[PDB]
Amino acid sequence: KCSLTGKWTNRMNHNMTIGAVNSRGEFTGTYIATVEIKESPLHGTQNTINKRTQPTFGFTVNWKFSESTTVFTGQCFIDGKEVLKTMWLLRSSVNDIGDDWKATRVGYNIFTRL
Amino acid sequence: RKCSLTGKWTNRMNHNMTIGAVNSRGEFTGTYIATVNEIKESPLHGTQNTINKRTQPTFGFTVNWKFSESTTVFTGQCFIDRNGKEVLKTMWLLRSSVNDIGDDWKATRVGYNIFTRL
Amino acid sequence: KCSLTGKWTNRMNHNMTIGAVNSRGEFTGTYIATVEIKESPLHGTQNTINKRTQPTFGFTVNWKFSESTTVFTGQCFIDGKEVLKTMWLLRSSVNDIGDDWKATRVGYNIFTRL
Amino acid sequence: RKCSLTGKWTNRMNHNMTIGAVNSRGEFTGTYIATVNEIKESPLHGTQNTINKRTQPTFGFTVNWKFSESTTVFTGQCFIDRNGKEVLKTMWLLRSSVNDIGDDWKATRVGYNIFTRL
Numbered sequence: 265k266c267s268l269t270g271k272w273t274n275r276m277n278h279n280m281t282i283g284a285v286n287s288r289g290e291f292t293g294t295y296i297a298t299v300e301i302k303e304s305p306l307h308g309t310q311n312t313i314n315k316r317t318q319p320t321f322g323f324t325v326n327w328k329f330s331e332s333t334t335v336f337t338g339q340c341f342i343d344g345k346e347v348l349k350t351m352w353l354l355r356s357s358v359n360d361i362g363d364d365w366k367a368t369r370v371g372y373n374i375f376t377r378l
Numbered sequence: 379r380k381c382s383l384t385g386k387w388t389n390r391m392n393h394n395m396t397i398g399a400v401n402s403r404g405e406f407t408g409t410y411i412a413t414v415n416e417i418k419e420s421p422l423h424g425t426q427n428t429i430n431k432r433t434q435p436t437f438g439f440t441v442n443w444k445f446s447e448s449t450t451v452f453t454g455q456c457f458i459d460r461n462g463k464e465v466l467k468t469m470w471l472l473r474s475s476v477n478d479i480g481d482d483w484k485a486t487r488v489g490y491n492i493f494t495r496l
Numbered sequence: 497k498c499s500l501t502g503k504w505t506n507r508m509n510h511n512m513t514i515g516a517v518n519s520r521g522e523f524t525g526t527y528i529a530t531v532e533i534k535e536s537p538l539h540g541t542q543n544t545i546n547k548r549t550q551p552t553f554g555f556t557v558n559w560k561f562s563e564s565t566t567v568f569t570g571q572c573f574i575d576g577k578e579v580l581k582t583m584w585l586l587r588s589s590v591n592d593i594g595d596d597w598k599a600t601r602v603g604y605n606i607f608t609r610l
Numbered sequence: 611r612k613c614s615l616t617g618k619w620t621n622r623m624n625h626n627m628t629i630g631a632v633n634s635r636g637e638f639t640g641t642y643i644a645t646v647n648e649i650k651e652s653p654l655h656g657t658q659n660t661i662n663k664r665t666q667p668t669f670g671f672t673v674n675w676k677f678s679e680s681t682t683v684f685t686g687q688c689f690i691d692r693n694g695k696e697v698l699k700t701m702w703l704l705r706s707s708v709n710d711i712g713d714d715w716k717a718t719r720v721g722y723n724i725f726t727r728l
């Protein structure tokens with residue numbers, strides 16, 4: 265079984281900590297990144313349909329130093345070692361609806377255990 | 379005059395999304411109802427941004443589909459349009475379940491959705 | 497048959513003109529947008545496997561006033577009226593490889609005939 | 611010391627992409643070879659940016675798959691890495707063929723690819 269609970273890092277030296285997943289798949293945690301270091305909360309869910317050993321999942325990071333919001337989704341894989349393959353959408357704040365077209369960046373991130 | 383996530387929302391596909399109270403930290407929960415004339419209903423959880431108490435906040439949420447192994451995340455902004463209507467402009471990523479990490483490349487879709495009140 | 501040749505516009509009052517598609521699917525054209533108006537070239541291909549009435553396609557716009565590049569892909573649909581449902585990636589120029597993570601915006605565009 | 615598109619490229623999946631001469635307007639053509647141990651080979655066409663004659667230009671291209679009704683577009687930048695190696699960091703969209711405009715939402719994938727010389 266691949267579980268999101270615990271501590272994770274990526275190629276950018278990030279520090280992601282996720283708490284216990286309840287039975288409905290819900291979780292909370294923390295996302296720590298450089299700018300000097302800031303902590304921001306994350307809330308998310310993990311699939312529990314068919315209790316897959318390698319579940320898909322999703323979460324939102326509500327950045328504390330910034331008007332933006334990021335969303336991540338992906339799958340917890342086994343390779344023996346655990347890895348989260350993710351993709352993300354970073355939403356910037358824009359002042360007027362007609363600037364919406366440029367408000368959204370996309371990318372990826374690979375996480376592995378501390 | 380502020381744009382809130384709380385309430386009933388629909389899009390051009392007749393989905394109905396219903397969002398509860400946004401708390402002091404911007405957290406909220408809700409439901410995503412969609413035709414799958416057969417209807418299924420899945421929980422969602424996420425946040426809206428609170429930094430500078432913006433009239434048009436950014437936000438994000440995860441829908442944990444009840445009938446599927448997939449997961450979808452939405453992000454976007456709650457705008458007041460020219461006509462005074464509140465609209466959510468969103469983009470999303472839909473993650474499918476694959477068996478081998480070598481299939482990861484084909485597992486992620488992207489699209490968009492515009493929601494208005496119902 | 498849905499063909500990319502001709503003149504197209506979208507909700508942003510853009511003006512896109514595409515030339516003749518050869519037999520391998522290749523095409524050239526022009527993308528015109530506000531900033532005052534600038535013309536930039538586009539080169540692309542259209543699928544010709546199975547000669548579908550509603551082909552998928554792709555093109556790159558090489559913006560003339562800017563270091564960026566945009567790519568579009570999508571499908572030419574019939575609804576009697578013709579419409580291109582697209583999605584796009586806008587690539588910004590960043591000065592150093594470790595800023596790559598923020599160089600890519602994503603979005604959409606619907607085109608219809610002039 | 612400039613990063614050029616011209617040449618042979620590979621990624622972490624053993625695709626081999628080969629790009630011809632970049633002309634004065636930045637246009638180029640090439641080939642994308644990929645396992646589909648069975649190999650298929652499809653044309654690609656696109657541009658690199660020339661505004662300010664940058665040492666690390668942005669670019670984009672379309673691969674017109676020979677064995678499929680799909681289309682894929684790549685965009686990214688040609689960087690000189692810390693070790694002096696040229697690397698293409700790319701993101702892509704893969705468009706599938708669907709029959710009805712109502713299925714359009716499920717037709718577009720997104721991923722990434724990192725290429726290095728071969």
Ligand SMILES: CC(=O)[C@H]1CC[C@H]2[C@@H]3CCC4=CC(=O)CC[C@]4(C)[C@H]3CC[C@]12C
Binds near residue numbers: 297332354373
């Ligand atoms: C690579 C990646 O996943 C992206 C998506 C959201 C991004 C963060 C968004 C907010 C941000 C603002 C900064 O000023 C420093 C870097 C950070 C903290 C970003 C680091 C890279 C992230 C984590």
Ligand SMILES: CC(=O)[C@H]1CC[C@H]2[C@@H]3CCC4=CC(=O)CC[C@]4(C)[C@H]3CC[C@]12C
Binds near residue numbers: 448
């Ligand atoms: C258009 C859009 O926002 C997408 C993102 C995730 C998609 C859903 C993912 C799961 C799903 C499976 C189906 O068989 C039809 C309806 C649904 C419920 C999809 C409808 C369209 C959605 C809501």
Ligand SMILES: CC(=O)[C@H]1CC[C@H]2[C@@H]3CCC4=CC(=O)CC[C@]4(C)[C@H]3CC[C@]12C
Binds near residue numbers: 508586604
């Ligand atoms: C909506 C959309 O497709 C986006 C993708 C690329 C975008 C263009 C990218 C370059 C650009 C720079 C400007 O200064 C004005 C607007 C334009 C001309 C953009 C208009 C919206 C476009 C066309």
Ligand SMILES: CC(=O)[C@H]1CC[C@H]2[C@@H]3CCC4=CC(=O)CC[C@]4(C)[C@H]3CC[C@]12C
Binds near residue numbers: 483644645678
């Ligand atoms: C990882 C990546 O960049 C993706 C984008 C488009 C994808 C290709 C699309 C068509 C295709 C069909 C197959 O059956 C296997 C190989 C290929 C050739 C895919 C391999 C991975 C590609 C190249």
Ligand SMILES: [Cl-]
Binds near residue numbers: 366
């Ligand atoms: Cl922006």
Ligand SMILES: [Cl-]
Binds near residue numbers: 588598599
């Ligand atoms: Cl940028």
